[PDB]
Amino acid sequence: IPDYFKQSFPEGYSWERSMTYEDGGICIATNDITMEGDSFINKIHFKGTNFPPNGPVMQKRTVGWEASTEKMYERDGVLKGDVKMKLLLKGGGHYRCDYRTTYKVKQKPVDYHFVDHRIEILSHDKDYNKVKLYEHAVARNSSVIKPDMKNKLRMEGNVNGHAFVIEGEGSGKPFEGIQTIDLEVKEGAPLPFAYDILTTAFNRVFTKYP
């Protein structure tokens, strides 16, 4: 399996993602990923709208994302990833969302493969102003990048009219597909919406490819 994300460096890559929730809530996000030495640099823009004021996002009733499988494939020479995601609710149901991502990797001109995800909030303070987040990602069939590397990000976001800024400092194992990050809300505290809707926007370079 080709690893178009690691091959994108040192130059880097970007991605664009739509997230369509089952109750009309919609989020759009972009990330521009560069590398400055031992660290990846993520510049993230996140916008979300049409979340019902009584839905699980605006009432903070989500409990985490279910493990997922993302189908990675090529069309028109562009790398794409689709994954049906499920957000678990405190009452036991699932709140569904369709993710569609365009991965603008190094190679403009490039057999699908999968990426199995597990993402989890390991700890958080009361209002999620500070969050420790973890991801595990592995690709499976149908030396610019050190075994250990830092990952830094800044997100400028607006959800249902509420602006906010979040920055994170973390590290991971690019070749083992493991990473963690410490996230801090820098503007817009306290967030009035479910933190879970942001965590997947907080870098497929941290994926275990054969």
mmCIF file of C-alpha atoms in Angstrom:
data_model
loop_
_atom_site.group_PDB
_atom_site.id
_atom_site.type_symbol
_atom_site.label_atom_id
_atom_site.label_comp_id
_atom_site.label_asym_id
_atom_site.label_seq_id
_atom_site.Cartn_x
_atom_site.Cartn_y
_atom_site.Cartn_z
ATOM 1 C CA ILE A 1 0.000 0.000 0.000
ATOM 2 C CA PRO A 2 1.340 3.421 -0.981
ATOM 3 C CA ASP A 3 1.610 5.919 1.900
ATOM 4 C CA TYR A 4 0.743 9.169 0.181
ATOM 5 C CA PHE A 5 0.842 11.116 3.456
ATOM 6 C CA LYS A 6 4.385 10.298 4.547
ATOM 7 C CA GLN A 7 5.545 10.698 0.954
ATOM 8 C CA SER A 8 4.174 14.244 1.070
ATOM 9 C CA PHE A 9 7.015 15.476 3.210
ATOM 10 C CA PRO A 10 9.042 17.578 3.783
ATOM 11 C CA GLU A 11 6.743 19.673 1.557
ATOM 12 C CA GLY A 12 3.513 18.697 3.318
ATOM 13 C CA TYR A 13 -0.127 18.379 2.390
ATOM 14 C CA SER A 14 -3.612 19.648 3.121
ATOM 15 C CA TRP A 15 -7.089 18.204 3.386
ATOM 16 C CA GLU A 16 -10.700 19.343 3.082
ATOM 17 C CA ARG A 17 -13.513 17.551 4.898
ATOM 18 C CA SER A 18 -17.305 17.739 5.060
ATOM 19 C CA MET A 19 -19.181 16.272 8.034
ATOM 20 C CA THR A 20 -22.937 15.849 7.565
ATOM 21 C CA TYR A 21 -24.800 14.885 10.702
ATOM 22 C CA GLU A 22 -28.148 13.081 10.593
ATOM 23 C CA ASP A 23 -30.077 15.999 12.144
ATOM 24 C CA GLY A 24 -29.019 18.714 9.692
ATOM 25 C CA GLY A 25 -25.901 19.821 11.563
ATOM 26 C CA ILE A 26 -23.041 20.383 9.112
ATOM 27 C CA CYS A 27 -19.353 20.976 9.633
ATOM 28 C CA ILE A 28 -16.673 21.849 7.133
ATOM 29 C CA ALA A 29 -12.981 21.877 8.023
ATOM 30 C CA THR A 30 -9.581 22.309 6.390
ATOM 31 C CA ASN A 31 -6.052 21.596 7.595
ATOM 32 C CA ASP A 32 -2.727 22.669 6.089
ATOM 33 C CA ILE A 33 0.039 20.410 7.378
ATOM 34 C CA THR A 34 3.691 21.387 7.145
ATOM 35 C CA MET A 35 6.853 20.147 8.839
ATOM 36 C CA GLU A 36 9.366 22.378 10.648
ATOM 37 C CA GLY A 37 12.149 20.144 11.946
ATOM 38 C CA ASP A 38 11.038 17.475 14.408
ATOM 39 C CA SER A 39 7.445 18.696 14.376
ATOM 40 C CA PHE A 40 4.386 18.723 12.160
ATOM 41 C CA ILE A 41 2.542 22.048 11.983
ATOM 42 C CA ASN A 42 -1.256 22.018 11.485
ATOM 43 C CA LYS A 43 -3.268 25.152 10.569
ATOM 44 C CA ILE A 44 -6.932 24.183 10.931
ATOM 45 C CA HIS A 45 -10.098 26.050 10.022
ATOM 46 C CA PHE A 46 -13.387 24.626 11.257
ATOM 47 C CA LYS A 47 -16.911 25.866 10.622
ATOM 48 C CA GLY A 48 -20.173 24.281 11.717
ATOM 49 C CA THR A 49 -23.776 25.309 11.439
ATOM 50 C CA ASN A 50 -27.426 24.209 11.682
ATOM 51 C CA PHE A 51 -27.003 22.223 14.890
ATOM 52 C CA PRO A 52 -30.420 22.124 16.614
ATOM 53 C CA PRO A 53 -30.309 24.011 19.918
ATOM 54 C CA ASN A 54 -31.812 20.899 21.541
ATOM 55 C CA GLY A 55 -29.707 18.299 19.685
ATOM 56 C CA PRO A 56 -26.936 16.205 21.237
ATOM 57 C CA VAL A 57 -24.201 18.552 20.020
ATOM 58 C CA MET A 58 -25.587 21.762 21.506
ATOM 59 C CA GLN A 59 -26.722 19.938 24.645
ATOM 60 C CA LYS A 60 -23.334 18.168 25.079
ATOM 61 C CA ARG A 61 -24.826 14.675 25.180
ATOM 62 C CA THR A 62 -22.176 12.814 23.168
ATOM 63 C CA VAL A 63 -19.762 10.320 24.747
ATOM 64 C CA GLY A 64 -17.232 9.588 21.980
ATOM 65 C CA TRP A 65 -16.759 8.263 18.466
ATOM 66 C CA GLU A 66 -17.129 4.595 17.684
ATOM 67 C CA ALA A 67 -14.152 2.881 16.083
ATOM 68 C CA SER A 68 -14.465 3.398 12.369
ATOM 69 C CA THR A 69 -13.159 2.286 9.008
ATOM 70 C CA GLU A 70 -12.290 4.893 6.375
ATOM 71 C CA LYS A 71 -12.235 3.844 2.724
ATOM 72 C CA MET A 72 -9.238 5.502 1.006
ATOM 73 C CA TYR A 73 -9.459 5.600 -2.786
ATOM 74 C CA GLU A 74 -8.496 7.483 -5.935
ATOM 75 C CA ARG A 75 -10.776 9.409 -8.328
ATOM 76 C CA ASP A 76 -9.774 11.892 -11.036
ATOM 77 C CA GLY A 77 -6.285 11.646 -9.624
ATOM 78 C CA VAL A 78 -7.310 12.895 -6.177
ATOM 79 C CA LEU A 79 -6.993 10.998 -2.905
ATOM 80 C CA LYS A 80 -10.316 10.685 -1.095
ATOM 81 C CA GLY A 81 -11.512 9.135 2.199
ATOM 82 C CA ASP A 82 -15.106 8.284 3.117
ATOM 83 C CA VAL A 83 -16.190 6.943 6.484
ATOM 84 C CA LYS A 84 -19.553 6.541 8.148
ATOM 85 C CA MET A 85 -19.017 7.714 11.707
ATOM 86 C CA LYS A 86 -21.116 7.106 14.798
ATOM 87 C CA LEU A 87 -21.146 9.337 17.841
ATOM 88 C CA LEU A 88 -22.337 7.560 20.964
ATOM 89 C CA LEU A 89 -24.977 9.374 23.055
ATOM 90 C CA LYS A 90 -25.219 9.366 26.855
ATOM 91 C CA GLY A 91 -28.658 7.719 26.527
ATOM 92 C CA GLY A 92 -27.310 4.749 24.522
ATOM 93 C CA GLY A 93 -28.241 5.571 20.953
ATOM 94 C CA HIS A 94 -25.979 6.647 18.139
ATOM 95 C CA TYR A 95 -25.849 10.042 16.413
ATOM 96 C CA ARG A 96 -24.579 9.441 12.872
ATOM 97 C CA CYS A 97 -22.457 11.528 10.520
ATOM 98 C CA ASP A 98 -21.107 11.120 6.968
ATOM 99 C CA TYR A 99 -17.451 12.184 6.597
ATOM 100 C CA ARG A 100 -16.024 12.987 3.159
ATOM 101 C CA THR A 101 -12.413 14.079 2.947
ATOM 102 C CA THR A 102 -10.210 15.211 0.085
ATOM 103 C CA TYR A 103 -6.546 14.555 0.804
ATOM 104 C CA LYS A 104 -4.415 16.919 -1.296
ATOM 105 C CA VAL A 105 -1.224 14.847 -1.085
ATOM 106 C CA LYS A 106 2.131 15.642 -2.733
ATOM 107 C CA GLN A 107 1.409 13.728 -5.937
ATOM 108 C CA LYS A 108 -1.211 15.598 -7.959
ATOM 109 C CA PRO A 109 -1.383 12.658 -10.417
ATOM 110 C CA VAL A 110 -1.497 9.495 -8.208
ATOM 111 C CA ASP A 111 -6.943 -0.416 -5.558
ATOM 112 C CA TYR A 112 -8.698 1.293 -2.628
ATOM 113 C CA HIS A 113 -7.482 0.613 0.895
ATOM 114 C CA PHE A 114 -8.903 1.099 4.395
ATOM 115 C CA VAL A 115 -7.811 2.978 7.509
ATOM 116 C CA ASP A 116 -9.234 1.689 10.787
ATOM 117 C CA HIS A 117 -9.552 4.433 13.391
ATOM 118 C CA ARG A 118 -9.880 4.570 17.123
ATOM 119 C CA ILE A 119 -10.093 8.022 18.705
ATOM 120 C CA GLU A 120 -10.626 8.773 22.366
ATOM 121 C CA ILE A 121 -10.626 11.652 24.826
ATOM 122 C CA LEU A 122 -8.383 10.308 27.600
ATOM 123 C CA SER A 123 -9.096 13.145 30.042
ATOM 124 C CA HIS A 124 -10.630 16.617 30.152
ATOM 125 C CA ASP A 125 -11.401 19.361 32.613
ATOM 126 C CA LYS A 126 -14.977 20.398 33.405
ATOM 127 C CA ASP A 127 -15.648 22.674 30.421
ATOM 128 C CA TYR A 128 -13.239 20.883 28.043
ATOM 129 C CA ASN A 129 -10.978 23.921 28.095
ATOM 130 C CA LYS A 130 -8.145 21.407 28.441
ATOM 131 C CA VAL A 131 -8.340 18.009 26.747
ATOM 132 C CA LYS A 132 -5.971 15.091 26.280
ATOM 133 C CA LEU A 133 -6.800 13.284 23.033
ATOM 134 C CA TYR A 134 -5.553 9.968 21.579
ATOM 135 C CA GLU A 135 -5.750 8.378 18.130
ATOM 136 C CA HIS A 136 -4.844 4.965 16.755
ATOM 137 C CA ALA A 137 -4.859 4.471 12.988
ATOM 138 C CA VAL A 138 -3.823 1.454 10.879
ATOM 139 C CA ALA A 139 -4.058 0.910 7.111
ATOM 140 C CA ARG A 140 -4.985 -2.469 5.723
ATOM 141 C CA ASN A 141 -5.799 -4.044 2.390
ATOM 142 C CA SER A 142 -9.201 -4.578 0.802
ATOM 143 C CA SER A 143 13.825 9.095 6.529
ATOM 144 C CA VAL A 144 12.391 12.616 6.531
ATOM 145 C CA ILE A 145 10.090 11.417 9.334
ATOM 146 C CA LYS A 146 11.584 10.085 12.573
ATOM 147 C CA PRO A 147 10.028 7.204 14.541
ATOM 148 C CA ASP A 148 9.031 9.802 17.149
ATOM 149 C CA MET A 149 7.800 13.269 16.160
ATOM 150 C CA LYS A 150 5.977 16.237 17.683
ATOM 151 C CA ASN A 151 2.649 17.556 16.393
ATOM 152 C CA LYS A 152 1.430 21.139 16.898
ATOM 153 C CA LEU A 153 -1.789 22.727 15.752
ATOM 154 C CA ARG A 154 -3.989 25.792 15.895
ATOM 155 C CA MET A 155 -7.687 25.708 15.007
ATOM 156 C CA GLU A 156 -9.753 28.799 14.187
ATOM 157 C CA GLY A 157 -13.360 27.725 14.566
ATOM 158 C CA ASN A 158 -16.957 28.898 14.549
ATOM 159 C CA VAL A 159 -19.834 26.576 15.480
ATOM 160 C CA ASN A 160 -23.440 27.842 15.430
ATOM 161 C CA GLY A 161 -22.176 31.419 15.522
ATOM 162 C CA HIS A 162 -19.782 30.809 18.412
ATOM 163 C CA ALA A 163 -16.182 31.697 17.525
ATOM 164 C CA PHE A 164 -13.257 30.048 19.269
ATOM 165 C CA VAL A 165 -9.569 29.238 18.964
ATOM 166 C CA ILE A 166 -7.871 26.054 20.141
ATOM 167 C CA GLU A 167 -4.200 25.162 20.191
ATOM 168 C CA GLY A 168 -2.631 21.799 20.894
ATOM 169 C CA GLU A 169 0.829 20.400 21.581
ATOM 170 C CA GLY A 170 1.512 16.695 21.201
ATOM 171 C CA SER A 171 3.540 13.859 19.767
ATOM 172 C CA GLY A 172 3.116 10.442 18.249
ATOM 173 C CA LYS A 173 4.616 7.462 16.443
ATOM 174 C CA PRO A 174 4.105 8.067 12.703
ATOM 175 C CA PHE A 175 5.016 4.482 11.696
ATOM 176 C CA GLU A 176 2.987 2.850 14.491
ATOM 177 C CA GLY A 177 -0.031 5.093 13.807
ATOM 178 C CA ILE A 178 -0.298 6.352 17.403
ATOM 179 C CA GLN A 179 -0.440 9.885 18.685
ATOM 180 C CA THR A 180 -1.706 11.996 21.570
ATOM 181 C CA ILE A 181 -2.238 15.710 21.991
ATOM 182 C CA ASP A 182 -2.946 18.217 24.760
ATOM 183 C CA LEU A 183 -5.541 20.735 23.633
ATOM 184 C CA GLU A 184 -6.234 24.174 25.120
ATOM 185 C CA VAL A 185 -9.105 26.483 24.335
ATOM 186 C CA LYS A 186 -7.513 29.891 23.762
ATOM 187 C CA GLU A 187 -10.538 32.009 22.726
ATOM 188 C CA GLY A 188 -14.243 31.268 23.157
ATOM 189 C CA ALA A 189 -14.214 29.483 26.493
ATOM 190 C CA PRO A 190 -16.446 27.897 27.594
ATOM 191 C CA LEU A 191 -17.413 26.069 24.411
ATOM 192 C CA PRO A 192 -21.220 25.709 24.316
ATOM 193 C CA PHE A 193 -21.138 22.595 22.087
ATOM 194 C CA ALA A 194 -20.026 18.967 22.243
ATOM 195 C CA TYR A 195 -16.223 18.794 22.055
ATOM 196 C CA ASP A 196 -16.518 15.480 20.248
ATOM 197 C CA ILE A 197 -17.389 17.231 16.973
ATOM 198 C CA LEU A 198 -13.848 18.690 16.779
ATOM 199 C CA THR A 199 -11.623 15.790 17.783
ATOM 200 C CA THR A 200 -11.332 14.200 14.331
ATOM 201 C CA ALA A 201 -10.118 17.516 12.926
ATOM 202 C CA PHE A 202 -7.294 17.519 15.511
ATOM 203 C CA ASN A 203 -3.075 14.179 10.272
ATOM 204 C CA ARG A 204 -3.021 10.863 8.453
ATOM 205 C CA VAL A 205 0.787 10.874 8.585
ATOM 206 C CA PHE A 206 0.173 9.125 11.929
ATOM 207 C CA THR A 207 -1.047 5.943 10.280
ATOM 208 C CA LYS A 208 0.492 2.464 10.390
ATOM 209 C CA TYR A 209 1.088 1.620 6.747
ATOM 210 C CA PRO A 210 2.900 -1.656 5.784
#
